């Protein structure tokens, strides 16, 4: 402890050849009190292996993250091969570096104009070499620095680095063919850091890009349109006025953004309204057109793989109820006959794509039509991952307030548009 000098053997490179024994004046560190933990390590150290290297230019620009503690001229007690060690530093135009647990060392020659100034190296010249001691870097960092050779996921010259970073962040826009779009549409609540970062990504690719709640109808007409909804709209996306039009126009939809559930595609990038669709009917419709189910049955056959018809389990008791209400003095024998038809279309699994709402799926309302329209709306919110279109056949077209993403059509409309195929 009486020693004023940090004395060590200097070995270099993969061969760990011995360059010599050196000394470093640390007496200016013994007066201090902040770096006792550091000084104790310096003293007990008797050997220093210089295996890594960094150029002067890189130090001048990215070296400020280092915290300088002490700098001075090294003293050579023994010279085994210091000449060579000097030559390599000079040819490399940089400094050898050691990322220790308790300290960080830089070793360079006096010929290094750059580093002599970058660290105010003045005073006694004990030899051609100079050293600087910095505070250690976080264990985790030094570890990365050693594994800094090559990335697992390579960056492609043709992609913008901005997208590559998103890629690393588990938002792989290339996997979903985003960069072949003819138009990008971006929507989000505020503040919208991600949405406008996304705009940037695509503006870099020179793809026409628009962001906002109010999108002009003309932007959906392009050949390959992409619609990106930010996660902040995962529960309100049915408030976007343009949603149904978008679906009609063959747009591709995606949820994007950081999400924390526990707290091809990627984790923070998700498809919406992929294919197919759901069709449901209102009581007002079943009465205007009793044949409905057996009348749109053929459409369901064709779309047996991507479509389904969905009725509430209490649909028979629902019609009956509203049939008595509407017509209190209507005969009962007729009642059973109408009901048997529905029960038959449900009881007998004629079509495999005829499912029943779950009991907890039905949204309650005094009006059956409003109830069924609201249940389908809730179904879109919970199944936007399985089906694209959500169509509700209803007696009077302008009787129900429109739901974004849904098609509220009467039979004739459904007949000319959907059944024409």
């Amino acid at each position: 402890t009486l020693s004023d000098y940090f004395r060590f053997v200097l070995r270099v490179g993969k061969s760990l050849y011995y360059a010599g024994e050196l000394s470093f004046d640390i007496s200016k560190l013994k007066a201090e009190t902040e770096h006792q933990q550091l000084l104790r390590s310096l003293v007990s150290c008797k050997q220093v292996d210089v295996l890594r290297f960094v150029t002067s230019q890189y130090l001048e620009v990215f070296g400020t993250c280092l915290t300088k503690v002490l700098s001075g001229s090294l003293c050579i007690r023994s010279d085994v091969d210091m000449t060579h060690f000097k030559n390599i530093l000079n040819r490399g135009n940089g400094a050898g570096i050691v990322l220790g647990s308790n300290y960080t060392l830089l070793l360079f020659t006096e010929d290094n104009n750059a580093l002599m100034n970058l660290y105010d190296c003045q005073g006694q010249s004990n030899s051609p070499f100079w050293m600087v001691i910095f505070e250690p870097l976080e264990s985790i960092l030094v570890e990365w620095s050693a594994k800094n050779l090559r990335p697992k996921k390579p960056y492609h010259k043709s992609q913008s680095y901005l997208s590559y970073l998103l890629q690393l962040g588990h938002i792989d826009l290339h996997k979903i063919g985003a960069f072949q779009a003819t138009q990008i549409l971006i929507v989000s609540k505020q503040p919208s850091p991600e949405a406008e970062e996304l705009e940037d990504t695509f503006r870099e690719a020179a793809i026409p890009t628009f962001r906002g709640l109010e999108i002009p109808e003309s932007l959906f007409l392009s050949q390959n349109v992409f619609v990106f909804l930010n996660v902040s709209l995962e529960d309100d996306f049915d408030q976007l006025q343009f949603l149904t039009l978008a679906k009609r126009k063959s747009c591709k939809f995606f949820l994007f953004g950081l999400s924390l559930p526990l707290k091809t595609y990627s984790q923070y990038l998700r498809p919406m309204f992929p294919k197919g669709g759901v069709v449901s009917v209102t009581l007002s419709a079943l009465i205007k057109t009793p044949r409905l189910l057996e009348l749109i049955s053929p459409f369901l056959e064709i779309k047996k793989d991507s479509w389904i018809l969905i009725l509430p389990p209490s649909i028979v008791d629902m019609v009956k109820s509203y049939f008595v209400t509407n017509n209190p003095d209507k005969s009962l024998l007729e009642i059973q006959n109408l009901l048997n038809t529905l029960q038959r279309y449900l009881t007998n699994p004629a079509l495999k794509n005829v499912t029943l709402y779950q009991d907890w799926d039905i949204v309650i309302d005094d009006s059956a039509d409003v109830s069924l329209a609201s249940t389908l709306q809730l179904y879109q919110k919970k199944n936007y991952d399985k089906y694209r279109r959500f169509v509700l056949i209803h007696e009077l077209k302008n009787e129900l307030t429109p739901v974004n993403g849904l098609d509220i059509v009467d039979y004739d409309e459904f007949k000319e548009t959907f059944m024409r195929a």
Binding site: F53, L137, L149, P154, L168, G169, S259
Partner: protein, 153 residues
């Protein structure tokens, strides 16, 4: 006379405020924080080197029209050290480092940092909205590091 114009900036984004000299800056600080999905305590506002508390008024600090307030986000892990970690290489016994070898290294370092930041999200108590703005901040910073590395003359 009664009001003054102030500029709150974090180096990248500026916002102007019109407020009485007699009102606590609590509202101005909490407003700025909101636009970044941040809590007011998640930042540090300082005028002329000194920090500002939630009760000090422009009358106290004796602020003047068209003055500035610097907001400083709390440093994110070892984000600022990333490019330096990539520049480090083996001691040049025979070979010499390449500028392309550094960018390729920066790619790996940017990758390690990201994977670590994402994995670290369980330990984060912050809200979704705030962590989102941070992830975007990280990426824009990493992007800036890349442009700076390739700019080395």
């Amino acid at each position: 006379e009664t009001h003054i114009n102030l500029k709150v900036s974090d180096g990248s984004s500026e916002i102007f405020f019109k407020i009485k000299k007699t009102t606590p800056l609590r509202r101005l600080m909490e407003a700025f924080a909101k636009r970044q999905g941040k809590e007011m305590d998640s930042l540090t506002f300082l005028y002329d080197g000194i920090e500002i508390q939630a009760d000090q008024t422009p009358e106290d600090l004796d602020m003047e029209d068209n003055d500035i307030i610097e907001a400083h986000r709390e440093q994110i892990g070892g984000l600022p050290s990333l490019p330096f970690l990539a520049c480090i290489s083996d001691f040049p016994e025979n070979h010499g480092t390449s500028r392309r070898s550094a960018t390729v290294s920066l790619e790996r370092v940017h990758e390690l940092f990201t994977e670590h930041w994402l994995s670290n999200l369980k330990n984060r108590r912050e809200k979704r909205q705030e962590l989102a703005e941070e992830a975007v901040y990280c990426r824009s910073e990493m992007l800036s590091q890349r442009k700076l590395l390739a700019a080395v003359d």
